[PDB]
Amino acid sequence: SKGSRIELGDVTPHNIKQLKRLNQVIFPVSYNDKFYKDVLEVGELAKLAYFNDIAVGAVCCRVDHSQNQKRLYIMTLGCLAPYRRLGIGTKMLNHVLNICEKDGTFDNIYLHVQISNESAIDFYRKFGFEIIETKKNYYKRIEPADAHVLQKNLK
Ligand SMILES: CC(C)(COP(=O)(O)OP(=O)(O)OC[C@H]1O[C@@H](n2cnc3c(N)ncnc32)[C@H](O)[C@@H]1OP(=O)(O)O)[C@@H](O)C(=O)NCCC(=O)NCCS
Structure with missing residues (x-):
């Protein structure tokens, strides 16, 4: 982490426009205004990823109760193509794996x-x-x- 050029940040009504923009480029499926309203409410489960202080990726998750389990669902996790293979995905996935580990109640x-x-x-x-x-x-x-x-599997 030390000297890292990658940093995650909060999604806010101030930068949500930037999140949608990133998602439009990276992901082949379009997300509706409900998606974006919901991401503003999941707290640490939605993040923007920065490389050298440039917004280049984002991760958006949801808590899912299906199959009688408590599940974390990754709806989108990705970054801009020229910035891939630089550890940005790992930083975003480790962010979510760390939440599940601190919470302790997630099945998968x-x-x-x-x-x-x-x-x-x-x-x-x-x-x-x-x-x-x-x-x-x-x-x-x-x-x-x-x-x-x-x-x-986490359980
Ligand atoms: C998948 C994705 C999130 C990976 O993010 P990323 O920043 O490139 O991933 P990382 O740099 O942390 O690499 C993680 C490790 O995963 C593996 N990996 C990642 N991309 C790979 C590729 N293109 N080919 C082979 N291995 C790959 C490697 O082992 C890599 O470690 P390494 O660089 O030391 O070899 C990225 O390719 C992406 O944004 N994809 C488009 C969006 C998408 O389809 N995501 C899935 C949900 S629909």
Whole structure:
């Protein structure tokens, strides 16, 4: 962490415009105004990521109670293409893993990855996420439509 050029910051009504902008470039699915209203309310579960004080990424999560578990759902975690492989993803994922660890009541953390997202699969598997399912036709508008469900067990 020391000397690091990467820093995470809070999402606020002041920089939320910048979050949406980042998400529009990085992620193939569009998020509605509800998404953005909700992110302003999850506190530490939404962050902007900065490299040399430039906003280049963001992570947005939600608490999920499904399958009789308490789950952390990563809805978006990503950064701008020219800044990849610099540790920014790791900083964002470690931020969320650290919250779950301090809280202690989460059963797992999971997310959906388009089957073509080789680099995302590589990234999450490095941290102990596993493909636990491939959902056919998960995505409505993009090709390919299928998504892997990646999950890391915490319990
Ligand atoms: C997936 C993503 C978040 C990774 O972020 P990042 O900052 O590049 O990740 P990091 O620099 O912390 O790298 C983490 C480790 O993951 C693995 N990894 C990450 N990207 C990889 C790639 N393209 N190919 C192979 N391994 C990769 C590596 O082991 C890497 O460590 P290393 O650089 O020492 O080899 C990034 O590629 C991204 O923003 N993707 C677009 C958004 C997306 O699809 N995210 C998934 C949800 S839909």
